[PDB]
């Protein structure tokens, strides 16, 4: 087979780490480079294709897409990395004082017996006008070429019972390192939204650990160039409603996804299929560069979203459609 994917062996964790990051544009202000979420289901989309010079120009096209459940991810720290003759080197990490129960759970393999003594004397180290905290922020403000942000998942918002927040690193491609640490200063403990990283019609790339079977499977894979079709919002009702369809419905199928619950928060609808399976954590990066082709150019018009019960079969979209067709039954009246 493929000689490049060797050794074809098992990954270190469920949360795979991103080996590279996008380059830099110093002229821009501070922006995140990647965002994390959980893979959940495979839905059907039909839409009119506004692709010029095509065999399917202005025609309706069917294609299967995936909906990654993405909760608002919250910052709990920031890191500085110096440039060395031996690569990079973390000189200092610094944290946000008031951490959730979820991140505190990550630092223990046995949460139940533990006395929950996580960031106690470190929070006592904060307890003043800075002096030690502001010193280490100044340390990163002096040296360290690349500045990475420590974030975690709001797992309680997620319908999964895993209850253990995944820590990841996301660098910043907004130049002048002083602004990087000052952005992170303003954004300690703060919850970062999904639409405040990606928009619709953007080519992106996802990282994941691939569906294990028996050694075969359970590798970390990175597939590139995937178009985000819909950046949804949980507080916004009628997510399944397009500009065309406009029927008040959630993107979630009747009785949740296959092996996954309801979507009571933000979501990303990625073209095709992301690696890994449902209940698996993914991290969406932003393409590394300007990927300008006509595959990237077109701004899509989503016509209709399939929300039929994938569990078995589906002839209906909403529960309203079931009783509209069936009429009334015995247990009803």
């Amino acid at each position: 087979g493929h000689l490049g994917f060797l050794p074809r062996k098992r990954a270190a964790s469920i949360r795979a780490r991103v080996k590279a990051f996008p380059k830099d544009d110093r002229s821009k202000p501070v922006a995140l480079t990647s965002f994390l979420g959980y893979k959940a289901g495979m839905t059907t989309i039909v839409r009119d294709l506004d692709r010029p010079g095509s065999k399917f120009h202005k025609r309706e096209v069917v294609e299967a897409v995936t909906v990654v459940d993405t909760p608002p991810v919250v910052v709990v720290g920031v890191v500085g990395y110096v440039e060395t003759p031996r690569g990079l080197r973390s000189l200092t990490t610094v944290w946000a004082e008031h951490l959730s129960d979820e991140v505190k759970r990550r630092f223990y393999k046995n949460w139940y017996k533990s006395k929950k003594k996580a960031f106690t004397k470190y929070s006592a180290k904060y307890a003043q006008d800075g002096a030690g905290i502001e010193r280490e922020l100044a340390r990163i403000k002096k040296y360290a070429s690349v500045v990475r942000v420590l974030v975690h998942t709001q797992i309680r918002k997620t319908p999964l019972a895993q209850k253990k927040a995944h820590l990841a690193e996301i660098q910043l491609n907004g130049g002048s390192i002083s602004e990087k640490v000052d952005w992170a200063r303003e954004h300690f403990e703060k919850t970062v939204a999904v639409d405040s990283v990606f928009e619709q019609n953007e080519m992106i790339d996802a990282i994941a650990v691939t569906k294990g079977h028996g050694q075969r499977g359970y590798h970390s894979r990175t597939s590139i160039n995937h178009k985000i079709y819909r950046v949804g919002k949980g507080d916004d009702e009628a997510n399944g409603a397009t500009s065309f369809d406009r029927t008040k419905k959630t993107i979630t199928p009747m009785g949740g996804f296959v092996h996954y619950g309801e979507i009571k928060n933000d979501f990303i609808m990625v073209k095709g299929c992301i690696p890994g399976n449902r209940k698996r954590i993914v991290t969406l990066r932003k393409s590394l560069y300007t990927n300008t082709s006509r595959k990237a150019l077109e701004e899509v018009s989503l016509k209709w979203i399939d929300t039929a019960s994938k569990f078995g079969k589906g002839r209906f979209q909403t529960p309203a459609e079931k009783h509209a067709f069936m009429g009334t039954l015995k247990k009803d009246l």
Binding site: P52, G53, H57, K58, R59, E60
Partner: protein, 225 residues
């Protein structure tokens, strides 16, 4: 007046376009030169419509119509039908026909006054053609070729059929149409003359392989100058 152009480097113009006295239909491909050919000849006098039928470029040999009406097959989508009505004034009517067959361009070889159809067609279509288009319907064939829209190019000035037509069929069918008929070729010796070129009373657009002897025949019978 007799124009000579192409679509996606193909000689069969009547496949990918249908032209009347009041309108012209064109496919939506990558090339805009085919649309620019009719835009040069007709201009802003009569509307030229960018559209498809059942999501296909093959538009000319799938439809039927004249100055009074327009007829499309069962396979036509609702959005195409929506845009077609949005494009065309009240002088022209539009109606979808629920049918067995879909090739209306291969069946209905019509103008403003006389329509020639397939003998195997249902009665309801014949009842609807005469009402909407304001024409006379005739279940007639030419020289043992069952498709008549494919093998006949037709307008109010003159008519053109494939060269395999007998003299008996020429004189008899011309008496029905009230206009003279010539059995000639289009696009360097091809039988399919309806699909080979589009025609009306003031324009005759052909494919690029239509020779000067073929052009002289077309100019003579359809009487351009």
């Amino acid at each position: 007046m007799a124009t000579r152009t192409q679509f996606e480097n193909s000689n069969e113009i009547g496949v990918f376009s249908k032209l009347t006295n009041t309108y012209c239909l064109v496919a939506v491909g990558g090339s805009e030169n085919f649309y620019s050919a009719f835009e040069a000849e007709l201009g802003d006098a009569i509307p030229i419509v960018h559209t498809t039928i059942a999501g296909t470029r093959i538009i000319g040999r799938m439809t039927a119509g004249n100055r009074r009406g327009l007829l499309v097959p069962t396979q036509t989508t609702d959005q195409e039908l929506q845009h077609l009505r949005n494009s065309l004034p009240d002088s022209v009517k539009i109606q979808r026909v629920e049918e067995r067959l879909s090739a209306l361009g291969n069946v209905i070889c019509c103008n403003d006054y006389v329509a020639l159809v397939h003998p195997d067609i249902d009665r309801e279509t014949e009842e609807l053609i005469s009402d909407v288009l304001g024409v006379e319907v005739f279940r007639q064939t030419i020289s043992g070729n069952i498709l008549v829209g494919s093998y006949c190019s037709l307008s109010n000035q003159g008519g053109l059929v494939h060269p395999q037509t007998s003299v008996q069929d020429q004189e008899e069918l011309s008496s029905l149409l009230q206009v003279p008929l010539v059995a000639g070729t289009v696009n360097r010796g091809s039988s399919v003359v309806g699909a080979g070129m589009v025609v009306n009373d003031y324009l005759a657009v052909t494919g690029l392989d239509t020779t000067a002897p073929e052009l002289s025949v077309i100019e003579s019978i359809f009487r351009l100058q």
